[PDB]
Amino acid sequence: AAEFMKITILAVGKLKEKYWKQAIAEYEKRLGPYTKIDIIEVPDEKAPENMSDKEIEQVKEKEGQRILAKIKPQSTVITLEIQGKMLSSEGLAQELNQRMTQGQSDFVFVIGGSNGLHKDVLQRSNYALSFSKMTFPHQMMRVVLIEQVYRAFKIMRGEAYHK
Amino acid sequence: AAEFMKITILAVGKLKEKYWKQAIAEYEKRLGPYTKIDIIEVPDEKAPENMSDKEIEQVKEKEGQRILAKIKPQSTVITLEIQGKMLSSEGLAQELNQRMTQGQSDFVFVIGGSNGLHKDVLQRSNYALSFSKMTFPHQMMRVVLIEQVYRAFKIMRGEAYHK
Ligand SMILES: C[S@@+](CC[C@H](N)C(=O)[O-])C[C@H]1O[C@@H](n2cnc3c(N)ncnc32)[C@H](O)[C@@H]1O
Numbered sequence: 033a034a035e036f037m038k039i040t041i042l043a044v045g046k047l048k049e050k051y052w053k054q055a056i057a058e059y060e061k062r063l064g065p066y067t068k069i070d071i072i073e074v075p076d077e078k079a080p081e082n083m084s085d086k087e088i089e090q091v092k093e094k095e096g097q098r099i100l101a102k103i104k105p106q107s108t109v110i111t112l113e114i115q116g117k118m119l120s121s122e123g124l125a126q127e128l129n130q131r132m133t134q135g136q137s138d139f140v141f142v143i144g145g146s147n148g149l150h151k152d153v154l155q156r157s158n159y160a161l162s163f164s165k166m167t168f169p170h171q172m173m174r175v176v177l178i179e180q181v182y183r184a185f186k187i188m189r190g191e192a193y194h195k
Numbered sequence: 196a197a198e199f200m201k202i203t204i205l206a207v208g209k210l211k212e213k214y215w216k217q218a219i220a221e222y223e224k225r226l227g228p229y230t231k232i233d234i235i236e237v238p239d240e241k242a243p244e245n246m247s248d249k250e251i252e253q254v255k256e257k258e259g260q261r262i263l264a265k266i267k268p269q270s271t272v273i274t275l276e277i278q279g280k281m282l283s284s285e286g287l288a289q290e291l292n293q294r295m296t297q298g299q300s301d302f303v304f305v306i307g308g309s310n311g312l313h314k315d316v317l318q319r320s321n322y323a324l325s326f327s328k329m330t331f332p333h334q335m336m337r338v339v340l341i342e343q344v345y346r347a348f349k350i351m352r353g354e355a356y357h358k
């Protein structure tokens with residue numbers, strides 16, 4: 033218990049709108065006293081409309097190589113996958129708290145680019161996490177995720193906010 | 196087919212952050228050419244932390260009376276409920292398109308305040324829609340919803356955006 037948790041949001045591409053940036057800064061600020069959190073962005077390939085199957089795969093492969101070069105073998109990797117496992121807000125806090133009680137302290141949340149994640153990234157994942165059956169765009173998704181991490185930490189500390 | 200669809204987002208409370216306001220204005224602008232959309236806000240009760248069961252109920256009842264006074268008997272009411280039915284993005288477009296083909300053109304999406312929705316509002320609902328098992332705060336939820344309505348209309352028109 034001599035260590036605070038470490039949360040990394042590892043995402044593909046930069047945010048393009050000032051309002052998403054402002055939302056993320058506010059949740060980073062709110063999460064500051066509870067965990068070290070940092071956001072790491074890696075280059076996104078250009079994503080035209082209707083590319084071939086081949087081209088989609090190559091985009092995911094290039095982005096995947098960048099994502100994997102930023103991940104250490106000992107980190108607990110949680111990949112955001114539409115078709116991953118669904119958890120309630122109390123369920124996400126339970127899963128992180130359980131892993132923390134088990135000694136895990138370095139969590140890396142991974143967000144794919146517009147075409148999703150390469151099989152090698154999905155294979156390295158220690159937990160596939162779905163936020164919904166719906167498809168969220170990657171910029172907004174980053175905000176939704178950090179707000180939910182904020183929520184999970186309030187629940188874990190048993191502090192008011194989740195109504 | 197002499198009419199465009201009408202989308203109303205009926206929510207409790209005003210937005211407090213300029214960045215959520217900016218996000219909503221951008222999606223309203225993008226949706227403009229495809230549907231009439233408008234956002235109607237009704238007063239939110241104060242929501243302290245840990246109120247009694249009784250007090251929570253009374254908050255939902257007051258907000259519910261305001262919400263129901265803005266709803267017409269012929270509108271198709273879709274209530275956002277964490278425990279409602281889950282749909283994928285293609286599923287939400289299918290449900291709206293199906294209803295439109297059946298003659299429905301006035302859709303009212305309802306977002307509760309921090310404590311959720313009163314039973315009378317939930318009873319008037321023609322469809323309980325869940326966006327996730329997780330709990331989203333009401334301000335962010337409004338953004339997530341309008342982005343998804345934007346997405347459903349692009350899918351329904353068979354126009355690129357959903358990758
Ligand atoms: C536009 S989405 C991916 C669409 C792609 N067709 C797929 O099937 O993954 C971009 C990234 O955002 C994240 N994301 C979007 N919606 C999500 C959801 N409902 N649950 C978990 N992650 C989601 C995922 O990490 C995804 O790689």
Ligand SMILES: C[S@@+](CC[C@H](N)C(=O)[O-])C[C@H]1O[C@@H](n2cnc3c(N)ncnc32)[C@H](O)[C@@H]1O
Nearest residue numbers: 195275276277306307308311325326327329331
């Ligand atoms: C903080 S939430 C409600 C929490 C309350 N304990 C409940 O059980 O409804 C405020 C409003 O946002 C909307 N909302 C939040 N998360 C949602 C989700 N995952 N799916 C559908 N609606 C949601 C709902 O309309 C809800 O009334």
